[PDB]
Symmetry: C2
Subunit: 572 residues, 2 copies
């Protein structure tokens, strides 16, 4: 039947009131009230420059939206695909099973790409855009997006699609009448790390993730594609790695599958960045090569962070022929990435010290087993691995490693340099290492485990109780975690941040809930770096969740829907 | 391509080994090894009586399974539907995208229902069955299920479907050759509470939940259909409650929808038990009746447990005309239930004391505002409400209330009696109230919040931090929570238990993850009450999770799949 309520803006809150028949005042639907009652309406993330939404809405004919590309170039296929995708994005305003009346104004969307040949990902890429909406003649609307690149342009199409509201009282599709928006991201790297080796993720679910990412202007999918537990990456040059390493023959990522994901990402402004974690976090797949040590070592607690144990043996020269092949196969299909992630997860010293061949190698090279020594070995490995990586990608490109014993700012310069290596940070924002690194000129990606480890909070997967980094991190906590606060003056060295979904307790089935809507909080934090806190974003956060659900994302629930319909009554 | 591994049983663990070509030993697939390496094979829950799985498997033709019903009766439609459903259940053994070779033995399933007219739910219903599998002739199998009722019979079909394994090495569907099982549940009430008022749940997702419940022999769906936040229940007699109370016009449960859910439940041995929570937990829907007090009272912290505040006014005699109508409408569509839940959630004293009409009522009746008084009012309400409930269902039937101030064992006998009221327990298993109640003869349903509140662990929904009953409860903790331990000698008074999914932070999108596989732990605990702990159920728990995923349930992930393939290496 019929919606019986209406909403009215009062002190920044949409108040639910009965829609009494004996009134000369036109009733506002919930979303229509929200669009103007809220500082930023229904936008997520909120823009950084001009945020002028005006005061009024106009009724729109859903069938009379036409997109026009004004400057042609090398990104024609991308712009054309992005344009075709736009009506789908608009239809997200309409709840499922509801149908809008096909009446109202016609919409002309004008796409102005000022450098139509650019399609490369880079930390220096221009993601800026200008959005202007205004009436055109008597029966139409002029929506004009102006951007320095395709990437800024498709961001603009995303923001534009958010300026449509469905009036479920009247069954009208509406649109903000007078818009002036100018927008650019604070940070160039806005990412999600997806571990697809601790458990497998269907490529369908990976694509779905990219869709949700594009919806909130996240631009980097970090594909942690290998680890101790499995090797799903299809390497044509070393096929036994995935034949022996995959969880099953179907649980693999073929060249065709990866090319699909990479293209799907590109179309949506998402860089697909591969990781080969080494020399720790290796195991399954390497059987019969004699290139690992400690695989399945027992008791595991003595040799590694989590079962199964296993590490590369850096004293075998054949190892680097394998790596060269793995990296080359990666470079072939991950062909949009401008960066390579090489892991650098904490190496076990006990694991390396328990191998004869390694101990013999260190005797001949004048190194003792004192642990300045084992750091020497790790550096020896990384240097050789690095060399292979460059050969594989056919150029010097930036490389990422995690904060670890190797990347301790005190000695980091012995090994790496700040121009060649970006450091991904898992430590808390108040850890000394961050200041130490930033002073030495290093660039950072923030993944502090107290605010950005999206796996935290669930039951133990070894023994009983809860998992190691519990409690569960609410979106409030991810929203307030500010790299600018963490880095201070050195904030230009912060490239951005990344929500990490480690997968010992996540797979295809849990992926939507794990990431959404929490990764949206990161999305806004990194796009806008607002000085305001989470409570000022709360109402819009509740709307973005509903939007993901409309997309078919099984997003986590934040609050009773009653709270969304009754702003201000749910507080503490 | 091809599976490259095989598994071999060693000290109760299936060990992954290379499937070397130069062997005279036939390779075992992972599930085939598990079927005999494990004490109870792939069964969940494990049977209570005979659990003889034998030693061997037989290859089965998936197209040559035929079910025969030997004793006809009033449950013909149910038995026929249950039988038709059986091949689907068997196909769950096969992973998606895999196809079994259509060769092997033919299967004759013989269903012996010894009381073919019985189809009523009751605490005294007989859920027992006997399962025997043995070879029949040379080319077929005799599967015979013998049960005292339809309900025991469909339980038997569930267990039988679990005796099929897919050999992904050979692409063979297999089945345990020689089976002798006798089985009956320890507790008659094995339940899930689903709150569909704090957020709405699509009826599709409710049916899906029932499917997963049937899969592990849970028999009671407690439908917490109303609360302060919304009134989705379609009451024909008082239509303004749902017209004003629903979150939207589509977010309702029509008579047709509820009849569908109730029938779907019946076919699967699931009792759909409605709750009308009163006199607290009321709000939306009651506008313009003047039958509530404190609705949206501010500051909410002074008047209720969570916003919005609101309670029934028990001093209005019209109230009981409304309740009579609500209960009657409920009784019409919830026509399989033998029990009614009346809530009895903690009433606010401050809320009742802030009403003039209530204070005037208590003056005239010689009661002071001292709180012995307000307990008198609550009792006055419950007595009148109870009377309406009996009229509605057209018989005296057992009623459930929660542990509360009203049901404190010290004074409970002033108000209720142990024959008319069952008490649902949210307190911890070591709370004095449990012993106190059990000694007074009361029957209990266990929902201890430290082990059975499936909503615990996530972010705050008011303010920041985590929700009230955090941390998140792992399946380990729900498995080990034993009513028999909690109740001791009085354990026959424990009717069972219930996993509670409160929905301030759960809806359609999160429901599968919230409930599964954790509610399976409760399922085994209540069906078998094993003396062993969670670690003895671990391997089978990991399999049941995979089974739910095969059903299309987006179950939580417990552990890396690597752990499932490598029993014994993941421990603490």
């Amino acid at each position: 039947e019929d919606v019986v309520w209406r909403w009215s803006c009062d002190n920044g809150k949409c108040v639910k009131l009965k829609n009494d028949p004996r009134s000369s005042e036109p009733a506002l639907s919930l979303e229509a009230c929200k669009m103007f009652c809220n500082e930023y309406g229904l936008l997520w993330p909120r823009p950084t420059g001009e945020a002028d939404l005006g005061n009024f809405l106009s009724k729109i004919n859903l069938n009379s939206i036409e997109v026009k590309i004004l400057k042609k170039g090398a990104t024609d296929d991308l712009m054309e695909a992005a344009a075709k995708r736009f009506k789908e994005q608009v239809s997200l305003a309409i709840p499922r099973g509801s149908t809008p009346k096909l009446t109202g104004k016609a919409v002309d969307v004008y796409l102005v790409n000022e450098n139509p040949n650019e399609k490369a990902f880079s930390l220096e890429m221009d993601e800026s855009y200008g959005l202007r909406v205004s009436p055109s003649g008597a029966d139409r609307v002029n929506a004009t997006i102006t951007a320095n690149s395709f990437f800024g342009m498709r961001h603009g199409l995303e923001t534009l699609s958010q300026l449509f509201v469905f009036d479920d009282i009247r069954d009208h599709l509406l649109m903000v009448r007078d818009v002036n928006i100018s927008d650019k991201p604070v940070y160039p790297y806005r990412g999600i790390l997806l571990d697809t080796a601790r458990n497998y993720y269907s490529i369908e679910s990976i694509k779905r993730t990219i869709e949700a990412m594009a919806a909130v202007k996240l631009n980097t999918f970090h594909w942690h594609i290998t680890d101790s537990q499995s090797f799903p990456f299809v390497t044509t040059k070393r096929p036994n790695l995935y034949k022996f390493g995959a969880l099953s023959p179907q649980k693999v990522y073929t060249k065709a599958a990866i090319r699909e994901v990479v293209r799907f990402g590109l179309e949506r402004g998402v860089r697909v960045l591969p990781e080969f974690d080494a020399p720790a976090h290796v195991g399954e797949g390497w059987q019969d090569t004699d290139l690992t040590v400690c695989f399945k070592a027992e008791p595991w607690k003595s040799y590694c962070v989590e079962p199964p144990c296993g590490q590369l043996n850096p004293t075998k020269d054949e190892l680097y022929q394998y790596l060269e092949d793995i990296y080359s196969d990666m470079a072939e299909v991950f062909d949009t990435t401008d960066i390579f992630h090489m892991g650098g997860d904490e190496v076990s010293e006990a694991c390396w010290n328990s191998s004869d061949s390694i101990q013999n190698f260190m005797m001949q090279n004048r190194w003792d087993l004192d642990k300045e020594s084992f750091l020497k070995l790790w550096n020896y490995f990384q240097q050789k691995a690095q060399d292979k990586a460059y050969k594989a990608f056919g150029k010097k490109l930036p490389l990422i490693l995690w904060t670890s014993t190797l990347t301790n700012y005190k000695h980091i310069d012995d090994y790496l340099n700040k121009d060649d290596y970006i450091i991904q940070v898992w430590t808390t924002g108040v850890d000394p290492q961050i200041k130490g690194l930033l002073e030495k000129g290093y660039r950072l990606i923030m993944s502090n485990y107290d605010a950005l480890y999206f796996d935290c909070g669930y039951g133990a997967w070894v023994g009983a109780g809860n998992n190691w980094c519990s409690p569960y991190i609410g979106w409030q906590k991810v929203y307030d975690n500010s790299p600018a606060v963490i880095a201070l003056e050195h904030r230009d060295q912060v490239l951005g941040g990344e929500a990490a979904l480690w997968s010992e307790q996540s797979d295809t089935s849990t992926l939507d809930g794990r990431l959404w809507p929490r990764a949206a909080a990161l999305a806004e934090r990194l796009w806008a770096e607002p000085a305001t806190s989470w409570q000022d974003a709360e109402y819009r956060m509740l709307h973005i969740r509903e939007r993901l659900v409309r997309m078919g994302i099984q997003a986590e629930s934040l609050q009773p829907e009653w709270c969304y319909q009754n702003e201000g009554y749910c507080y503490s």
